[PDB]
Paper text:
Gene transfer agents (GTAs) are DNA-containing phage-like particles produced by some species of bacteria and archaea. The genes encoding proteins that form Rhodobacter capsulatus GTA particles (RcGTA) are derived from phage DNA, which has been integrated into the bacterial genome. Here, we use cryo-electron microscopy (cryo-EM) to determine the structures of RcGTA before and after DNA ejection, and to visualize the interactions of RcGTA with R. capsulatus cells. Particles of RcGTA have heads with a diameter of 38-nm and 49-nm long tails.
Unlike the phage heads that are isometric or prolate, the capsid of RcGTA is oblate with the shortened dimension along the tail axis. The organization of the RcGTA capsid is derived from a T = 3 quasi-icosahedral lattice; however, it lacks five hexamers of major capsid proteins in its central part, which results in a shortening of the head. By contrast, the quasi-hexamers on twofold axes of the oblate capsid are bent to enable seamless closure of the oblate head. The quasi-hexamers on twofold axes of the oblate head contain subunits in three conformations: two subunits binding to pentamers from different directions, and one binding to a hexamer of capsid proteins. The surface of the RcGTA head is decorated with eleven 70-Å long head spikes attached to pentamers of major capsid proteins. Each head spike is composed of a pentamer of base proteins Rcc01079, and a single subunit of head fiber protein Rcc01080. Base proteins attach to the capsid by the N-termini, each of which binds to axial domains of two adjacent major capsid proteins within a pentamer. The attachment is reinforced by the coordination of a cation.
Author numbering:
A (entry chain J4): 98 to 298, 305 to 385
B (entry chain D2), G (entry chain E2), H (entry chain A2), I (entry chain B2), J (entry chain C2): 1 to 84
C (entry chain F2): 2 to 11
D (entry chain M4): 89 to 97
E (entry chain I4): 146 to 193
F (entry chain I4): 243 to 298, 305 to 385
K (entry chain K4): 98 to 145
L (entry chain K4): 194 to 242
């Protein structure tokens, strides 16, 4: 009798639910169907006079302009699904792969927006020629150092963070956020005062500002930049094509299908003043 | 490996960094210490941030939880090491 | 270290 | 999403 | 892949699948009530 | 946790904070601790060096729900007395949402002998969405 | 340069400002000290805010964490410096 | 003038009020002290709120942070002053 | 009458209850003490919860803020009373 | 049975675990201690995490609340046991 | 064939974002089309 | 330019509202002869030290 059972299957083929925190929900996403996005910033400001009645005004300075090029690279996967499976497999494999591929792309481009170099991937804000804050230029991200090489400072811990906040400018702090990984927010949560009760009282906010728990920022290493903070809505611009072009090719490998999916995404920092970092050197 | 890392170092907490003090007389200390571990016995003079400075007839192994700005050299016969 | 009365370490 | 012969795929 | 412009894109991985069975057992209770009680006990003992 | 009986003697409340951050920011979107009654009590009895409680109706702990499931083991030698995870994906319950009862006036004759049996089953579906807290070392 | 600035100075914290005390006997202290660093050994008398005043047979380097209102001069044979 | 007024007096804080203790041996202390400043050396006996009472071979200037309910007179050869 | 009732007794707080310790050498202490008031001078041995146990060359009136699990009797020549 | 379990062990709290230190000179301590219970008198040298290392003319029963990274062996004539 | 691409410029020219906390949003703004404005306060009060 | 000038004006007039003196610009609330609070007149701003 045990042959008359037919165990029931799921409705949808589930999957391990990996992190979708991608810095894309806070950065400036701009849909462009071109080969590059040229964002235009004003690295300086104007001048004003408090004129008199008989001043005979002269020229006031005019802001000088900078152009940043977003090369808009592309990202491609080609999973080869058999043809005997696609028709015998009452689940929908065509829309599962497309749902699963877009998941892998949103997770592969998430790492590129942070620690991605320039070669055929977005230049993450961590590869942007970091300069010690206070000696801040325009073509560089300003960082504040904590003290001891590995961890936070030995005496005034949490002061390398509270000045990282107030080193960013009054206007970008209005909507800014920390960026760490899971292992650093834990290393921050474990910070405790002279008694043992940790001194930091669903966004998992810190000091009132939101925290985007990425999974791609470097750990707390000798000279790593594990904590960033800034208004990525103005500091980081993402250019992309907001779709997923899936070309199924039942031709190359003939008894298979060989889906060829590819999205195009790029991005660099737009405002070097809108992202401040935390180095652990000294 | 310190199990008491991530604890905030307060004033009442034990000494994390130490440095021997020299009685400059004319300049303040580079860091003001939380306490003074006295090296050898004698008299030494200590100044607040208010200028009130007095002489202490200190003993050799004595460790005195006073937090001075300047250690002068006129009445100082006792060498110390500052704790912080 | 300092001026408490508490049988403590420091 | 491969051959329907091997169960693991 | 982070495909290049001229790279001749090759095969990429494919997620493997695991099936987990839920044998769906059963759970039985058999209380015994006297028929005299079920008629004389204005509280609905059937539904209780 | 460190010690074999209870939380770490040198620094407790960290075997809990790294239990939380041992899940992944996607399963922590909706996760919840699962303890019995006398464990949430042993967590709430935790006080810092000053004597105040470190963790200040749903008994939320560290911002996450707490499910008081009377069936988990208590704090013991190697017990996993505290589990934390997203069970919405981690544990799948398969059931029939009705109870079938059969009243039987025949077997025990002057009695009625009800017989009610629902069918339920279920184990874990996503091993990545449930992390435990062993109390051994 | 103090790294422990912006920390609140509590009663249990180390001594920030010091001042030598003179046993006025008829007026209170200008500031009541957190502790008394004794300069030379002897007996000295100390008064609470409740009047209870007793005599302490103190020793030379002894530092006693009592917080007095008035230090009288009748039984005082030991000079001290108040810590605060 | 106390700058440390409005601070709460804790158990770890310095002594605010003092009172000399007499070993009544049949009644408890009027106030139980935070510590005992010993006046003269000897042995003295101290009782908890649990009755456990033991003898302490104390020294003259010794200040012992024990908080007793009753100080008995049978084994007491050392006079003290309670701090609070 | 204690004015410091309703205050929580911490580890840094003064000793509330005391009990003389006997070096059982095979069983742990009934309560582990916050500190050890040493009665008479000598050497005594103390064990952690980690087994590390060492010998302390302690002095008579010495009060040492170590929190032991077991006090053994092999090297113990000094009697103590535990504070808690 | 400890009534002070579930209390967080701070830096100011009493010593929970102890371990005797050997002056390796070339490697750091396995755990850096909160304090040093000195076993026998002498001079011993201690290093911060900043390298500043000095010599301390310590005494036998002295317990010094300094928190060192490395204890060197060149000037060390005093054995200690670290508290933590 | 790389000359045939023509990068896309932004829609508007962005700029470095500076502090607009101006004390104008907590003070009393009064539109006045004149050469001056004369507030008339009472530096004292009456008596009852 | 009008969006950039209207910004610089909101940022140049905000500086004068605080530390600007009387000459050809608003007098900030800091340049108003501060006097210690307790000795508070009307033609001055009170302060605590």
């Amino acid at each position: 009798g045990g042959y008359l059972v037919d165990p029931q299957t799921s409705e949808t083929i589930r999957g391990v639910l990996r992190s979708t925190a991608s810095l894309r929900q806070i950065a400036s996403v701009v849909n462009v169907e071109a080969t590059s996005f040229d964002v235009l910033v004003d690295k300086t400001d104007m001048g004003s006079g408090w004129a008199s009645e008989t001043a005979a005004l002269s020229e006031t300075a005019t802001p000088q302009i900078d152009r940043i090029t977003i090369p808009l690279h592309e990202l491609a996967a080609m999973p080869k699904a058999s043809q005997r499976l696609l028709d015998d497999s009452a689940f929908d494999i065509e829309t599962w792969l497309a749902n699963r591929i877009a998941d892998k792309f949103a997770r592969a481009e998430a790492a590129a927006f942070i620690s991605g170099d320039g070669v055929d991937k977005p230049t993450g804000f961590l590869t942007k020629t970091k300069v010690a804050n206070g000696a801040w230029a325009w073509g560089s991200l300003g960082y504040v150092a904590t003290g001891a090489a590995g961890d936070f400072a030995a005496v005034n811990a949490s002061d390398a963070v509270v000045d990282l906040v107030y080193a960013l400018g009054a206007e970008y702090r209005a909507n800014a956020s920390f960026v760490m990984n899971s292992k650093t927010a834990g290393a921050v949560r474990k910070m405790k005062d002279a008694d043992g009760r940790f001194l930091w009282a669903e966004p998992a906010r810190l000091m009132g500002y939101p925290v985007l728990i990425a999974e791609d920022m470097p750990d707390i290493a000798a000279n790593a930049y594990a904590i960033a903070f800034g208004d990525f809505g103005n500091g980081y611009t993402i250019a992309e094509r907001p779709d997923l072009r899936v070309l199924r090719d039942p031709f190359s490998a003939k008894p298979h299908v060989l889906f060829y999916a590819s999205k195009r995404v790029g991005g660099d920092v737009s405002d070097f003043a809108a992202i401040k970092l935390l180095k652990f050197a000294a | 490996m310190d199990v008491f890392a991530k604890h905030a170092v307060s004033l009442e907490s034990p000494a994390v960094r130490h440095y021997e003090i020299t009685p400059s007389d004319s300049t303040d200390l580079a860091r003001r210490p939380r306490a003074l571990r006295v090296q050898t016995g004698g008299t030494l003079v200590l100044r607040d941030e208010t200028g009130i400075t007095v002489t202490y007839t200190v003993f050799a192994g004595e460790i005195l939880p006073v937090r001075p700005v300047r250690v002068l050299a006129t009445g100082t016969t006792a060498t110390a090491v500052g704790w912080e | 270290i300092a001026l408490g009365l508490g049988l403590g370490l420091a | 999403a491969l051959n329907s012969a091997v169960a693991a795929e």
